[PDB]
């Protein structure tokens, strides 16, 4: 499992004297073979925050249906104000994505896709929107089984 630190953020809680600072780490973990997850970790130092985030991400993983390195179909993943449009591309296109979306897609193993963040650019909600889209993706075989037909009947 490869892991990428998306963002590290120094948050503060106010106390009677001064402030208590902590580090929050958002991390994406993936095998580059259709499995991806994300996690957050809070600690007094960034290495420990990253370690906790990685453990949480490994706890939470999703399976991404793929077709030769790209998604089966266009999808818009939404979470809160996050919103990420994603569209299958052709080989050699590359991953046309910005910010946390690229982390999520590359670690999921997608190498050719087009995307656009249409909503909030706050990294955690961007990641959640991307994961929501990948979760709602569908594959031809599963939809054929659900609709009680064959792939050939599906495509006519």
């Amino acid at each position: 499992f490869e892991e990428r630190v998306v963002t590290i953020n120094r948050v503060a809680k106010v106390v009677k004297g001064g402030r208590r600072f902590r580090f929050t780490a958002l991390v994406v973990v993936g095998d580059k073979n259709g499995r991806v997850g994300f996690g957050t970790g809070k600690a007094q130092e960034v290495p420990e925050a990253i370690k906790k985030a990685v453990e949480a991400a490994k706890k939470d993983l999703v399976v991404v249906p793929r077709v030769e390195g790209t998604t089966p179909h266009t999808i818009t993943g939404r979470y809160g104000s996050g919103s990420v449009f994603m569209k299958p591309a052709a080989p050699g296109t590359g991953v046309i994505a910005g910010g946390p979306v690229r982390a999520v897609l590359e670690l999921a193993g997608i190498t050719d896709i087009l995307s656009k963040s249409l909503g909030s650019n706050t990294p955690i909600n961007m990641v959640r929107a991307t994961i929501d889209g990948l979760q709602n993706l569908k594959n031809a075989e599963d939809v054929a089984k659900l609709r009680g037909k064959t792939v050939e009947e599906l495509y006519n």
Binding site: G92, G94, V95, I96, G98, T111
Partner: peptide, 10 residues
């Protein structure tokens, strides 16, 4: 070469 393709993408 994918890195260079992406570089010229942005």
């Amino acid at each position: 070469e994918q890195l260079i393709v992406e570089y010229y993408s942005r």
